[PDB]
Design a protein that fits this description.
The complex is a heterodimer. Chain A is α+β, with helices and mostly antiparallel strands. Chain A is 42% helix and 12% strand. Chain A has a 3-stranded antiparallel beta sheet. A 3-stranded antiparallel beta sheet of chain A has the order 10-11-12. In chain A, β4 and β5 form a beta hairpin. In chain A, α4 packs antiparallel against α7. Chain B has 2 domains: 176 residues, Rossmann fold; 85 residues, Cytochrome-c3 Hydrogenase, Chain A, domain 2 (Irregular), CATH 4.10.480.10. Chain B has a 5-stranded parallel beta sheet, sandwiched between helices. The chains are: A alpha+beta, B alpha/beta. Chains A and B meet through α1, α4, α6, α7 and β5 of A and α1, α2, β2, α3 and β5 of B. The structure holds iron/sulfur cluster (2 copies), carbonmonoxide-(dicyano) iron, FE3-S4 cluster (F3S), peroxide ion, magnesium ion, nickel (II) ion and 1 more. Chain B: Its main location: periplasm. Chain B: Its cofactor is [4Fe-4S] cluster; [3Fe-4S] cluster. Chain B: Its EC number is 1.12.2.1.
């Protein structure tokens, strides 16, 4: 029995899911990415300095992160040590991206799998407001919830549902179990988050020039001296505090509220191997200098964290649309596209299949939060303990779709909390008359380099080989490549394919259970394929 | 059934254009899609999935609607490089675009081909008017990578209230793309005076001297970045970085290397 969901909506890019069902549970799965662009092919022979501009266009949702990975890789192959202010500025910009990215994912990409907007019309608004007031410290009025209810009403009565047209929750759905009051609060916050995200992206643009697609980084550091003015720094600070408060007081509390009604999702979507390179360094040449730590977890075992070893990465193509079946470490990566139709020669995707020491891994917030928890990163310990105590579960509940969703919230929180530290340091440096942002550098005759970035979706790495200031090879291996890529030559399912096994399907015609698990990985197909 | 219908297609894109739309102010995106238009198809945002949204698209293109296309259209070797629900993106656009009352190509990918159309262009990706011109499609090109949200929303409003705006030779609304970045750049005084930064770390860069010698393509680039700003706060040159010509046809090859004049 075959179910196909194509297109998968509320993600970035072009994904098709095919699943086999038996007894009302998924018994097998295929993750099919259906757009190829070929950025690595385009980069060959070009100027290393142009790289960050092309690779940023890998994706406009996780904007900035590919530019960071590229200047880190070129910084690295050239041996330059950028000044402290460049490190601070780059970290600040990444912090703002975490804040913006995770907010938009929860409300605008993920929530509609759990929230029945139409049922919001049945909510008693006074009762919803009181519940809102128990959940968060800020005050909500009956009146504002009535207004939201009125807006949903105009939409439904107009007969133009727009983006709600043919929703899986229309006419009721056995998998949507939220009480009407909670559906209303979620909907109100969904609308509010549309305005909050605008403030997060503005904060980012103060250092980054613009959002989407920043323009302030160069090999050797950053260019944005203008942002070093007290005025600009104060303006960042104020936006940053508003977005932070909303995250703390609305996002996190909404997340726990909704999770509470779906505690069964703690037993669904279990996976086993996790890794991260860490993010936010003080030393651009030492992963252990990073605010969130690097680490590798094998088979759900939190008592032992191995060191991240990038020598162990290989990308497979046996089940993808590329020539042949060999796997390569990215310094020797090959990108030779070869289409064979859906399942032709059993191939079903434009993503390569990254494996770590031959095994399939999951990356991203959960993976990052697990490693930091295992290593006793105190900010993460406190955030995790809160989720766990709030839901009434032990740490075993984290290895799941519900846990993957909670972990995104924690990752957002721990980043937001640290941002003020980097900002104070940058300011104190400037006040003391230390305003350097750039370090001169020169091309080695011949060199290679690598940049590691823990993006909002997970471990990102750009790999360059250059000769005479010309690119000989440039490969990206990106978090969604790991999460949503297909089987490798050993036939091992990827994180998302494996996570889907066992998933119960109440209504095969409207398989929202598939969306829930897929969305918890926050898929980005332009990222994954490039 | 009161608000004007808009159908929004995603092709060979990074989705940065969709994101730029979310950055709109006055109106904000909620006002845009609750009060100004009806967003009848948009893959990034829609609650349903799979067959349910393809049915929504089928119904929506029976009416009077404006079509918005993001991303290039792959045409190389038959066009299989980009598929949605099994269909090649060309076939989807060929079906939808000619039915609209007006078509908007958003972003340089949709207008001219964009990043994936850069050499050696393995997917054979082209822009909207190049792919669909033979079918009678004449799209308004909102160029930029991504464009200023005001250039897209301003164009939709204009279409709704005044009709088709006047376009330049490359199909861009003259009301937004009529002058170069350079014409309106605050560093123009330095440029004419010969006051240039020769390195990103020099005192001259710290002083905000013109970036022409570090690669700036402002003099050849039609956009409203300096006067409009992005996110209401900034733009590349204000942030010390050269313009890379992101609203110009074929900028990826014609204006790089980015750091030399
Ligand atoms: S024009 Fe630029 S921002 Fe828009 S889809 Fe293309 S690459 Fe992305
Ligand atoms: S910085 Fe660029 S746009 Fe501004 S005056 Fe100089 S060359 Fe012109
Ligand atoms: N976050 C993010 Fe995009 C993906 N996957 C990258 O890197
Ligand atoms: S790079 Fe693009 S955003 Fe404006 S400053 Fe140049 S046209
Ligand atoms: O989005 O990556
Ligand atoms: Mg790659
Ligand atoms: Ni992305
Ligand atoms: S650079
Ligand atoms: S282009």
């Amino acid at each position: 029995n075959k179910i196909v969901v194509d297109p998968i909506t509320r993600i970035e890019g072009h994904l098709r899911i095919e699943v086999e069902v038996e007894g009302g549970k998924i018994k097998n799965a295929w993750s099919m990415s259906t757009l190829f662009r070929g950025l690595e092919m385009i980069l060959k022979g070009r100027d290393p300095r142009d790289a960050q501009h092309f690779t940023q266009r890998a994706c406009g949702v996780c904007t900035y992160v590919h530019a960071l990975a590229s200047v880190r890789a070129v910084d690295n192959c050239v041996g330059v040590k950028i000044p402290e202010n460049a490190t601070l500025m780059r970290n600040l910009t990444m912090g703002a991206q975490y804040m913006h990215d995770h907010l938009v994912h929860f409300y605008h990409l993920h929530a509609l799998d759990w929230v029945n907007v139409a049922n919001a019309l049945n909510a008693d608004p006074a009762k919803a407001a009181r519940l809102a007031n128990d959940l968060s410290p800020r005050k909500t009025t009956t009146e504002s919830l009535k207004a939201v209810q009125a807006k949903v009403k105009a939409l439904v009565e107009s007969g133009q549902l727009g983006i709600f047209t043919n929703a899986y929750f229309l006419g009721g759905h056995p998998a949507y179990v939220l009480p009407a009051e909670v559906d209303l609060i979620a909907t109100a916050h969904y609308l509010e988050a549309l305005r909050v995200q605008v403030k997060a992206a503005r904060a980012m643009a103060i250092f980054g020039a613009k959002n989407p697609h920043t323009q302030f980084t160069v090999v050797g550091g950053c260019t944005n001296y203008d942002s070093l003015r007290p005025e600009r720094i104060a303006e960042f600070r104020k936006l940053y505090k508003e977005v932070r408060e909303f995250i703390e007081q609305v996002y996190i509390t909404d997340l726990l509220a909704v999770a509470g009604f779906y505690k069964n999702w703690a037993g669904i979507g279990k996976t086993s191997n996790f890794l991260t390179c860490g993010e936010f360094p003080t030393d651009e040449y030492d992963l252990n200098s990073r605010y969130t730590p690097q680490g590798v977890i094998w088979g759900n075992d939190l008592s032992k964290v191995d060191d991240f070893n990038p020598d162990l990465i290989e990308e497979h193509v046996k089940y993808s649309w590329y020539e042949g079946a060999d796997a390569h470490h990215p310094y020797k990566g090959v990108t030779k596209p070869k289409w064979t139709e859906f399942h032709g020669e059993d191939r079903y995707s434009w993503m390569k299949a990254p494996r770590y020491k031959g095994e399939a891994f999951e990356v991203g917030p959960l993976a990052s939060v697990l490693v930091a928890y295992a290593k006793k990163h105190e900010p993460t310990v406190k955030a995790v303990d809160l989720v766990l105590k709030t839901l009434g579960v032990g740490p075993e509940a984290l290895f799941s779709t519900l846990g993957r969703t909670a972990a995104r919230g924690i990752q957002c929180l721990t980043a937001a909390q640290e941002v003020e530290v980097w900002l104070d340091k940058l300011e104190a440096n400037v006040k003391a008359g230390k305003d350097d942002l750039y370090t001169d550098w020169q091309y080695p005759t011949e060199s290679q380099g690598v940049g590691f970035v823990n993006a909002p979706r997970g471990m990102l790495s750009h790999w360059i080989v250059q000769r005479g200031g010309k690119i000989e090879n440039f490969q990206l291996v990106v978090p969604s490549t790991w999460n949503l890529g297909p089987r490798c030559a050993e036939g091992k399912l990827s994180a998302v394919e494996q996570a889907l096994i066992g998933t119960p399907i109440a209504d095969p015609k409207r398989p929202v259970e598939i969306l829930r698990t897929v969305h918890s990985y926050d898929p980005c197909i332009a990222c994954g394929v490039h | 059934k009161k608000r004007p219908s808009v159908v929004y297609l995603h092709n060979a894109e990074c989705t940065g254009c969709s994101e730029s739309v979310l950055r709109t102010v006055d109106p904000y995106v909620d006002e845009l899609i609750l009060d100004v238009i009806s967003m009848d198809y948009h893959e990034t945002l829609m609650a349903g999935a799979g067959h349910a949204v393809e049915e929504a698209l089928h119904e929506a293109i029976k009416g009077d609607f404006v079509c918005v296309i993001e991303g290039g259209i792959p045409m190389g070797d038959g066009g299989y490089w980009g598929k949605v629900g099994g269909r090649n993106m060309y076939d989807i656009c060929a079906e939808v675009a000619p039915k609209a009352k007006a078509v908007i190509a958003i972003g340089t990918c949709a207008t001219y081909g964009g990043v994936q159309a850069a050499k050696p262009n393995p997917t054979g990706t082209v822009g909207v008017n190049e792919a669909l011109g033979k079918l009678g499609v004449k799209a308004i090109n909102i160029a930029g990578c991504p464009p200023n949200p005001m250039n897209f929303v301003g164009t939709v409003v204009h279409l709704l209230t005044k009709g088709m705006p006047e376009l330049d030779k490359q199909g861009r609304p003259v009301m937004f793309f009529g002058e170069t970045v350079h014409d309106n750049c605050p560093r123009l005084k330095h440029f004419e005076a010969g006051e240039f930064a020769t390195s990103f770390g020099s005192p001259e860069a710290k002083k905000g001297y013109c970036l022409y010698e570090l690669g700036c393509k402002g003099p050849d680039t039609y956009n409203n970045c300096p006067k409009q700003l992005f996110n209401q706060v900034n733009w590349p040159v204000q942030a010390g970085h050269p313009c890379i010509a992101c609203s110009e046809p074929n900028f990826w090859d014609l204006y790089s290397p980015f750091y030399s004049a």
